[PDB]
Amino acid sequence: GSRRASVGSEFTESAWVRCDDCFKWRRIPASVVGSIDESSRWICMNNSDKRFADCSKSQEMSNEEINEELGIGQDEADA
């Protein structure tokens, strides 16, 4: 199910979002992170940026580079 495990806190300034059809990441304004709930199925095909708007496209920072910028245990899921 798309209500994937764990959660953070707040909306704050500009954020990331995960694809619920794979697991790839995209940088978004906080106006989208306030619209997307845990139940909201955000995916690559819906992505704002047509350069990255597929499960087959790339991302702004690889999962082991982004999770280090936040300083967190993301991608450890393997799923």
Partner: peptide, 9 residues
């Protein structure tokens, strides 16, 4: 959609 937000201004 499990995610987070960067501590980088």
């Amino acid at each position: 959609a499990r995610t987070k937000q960067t501590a980088r201004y």
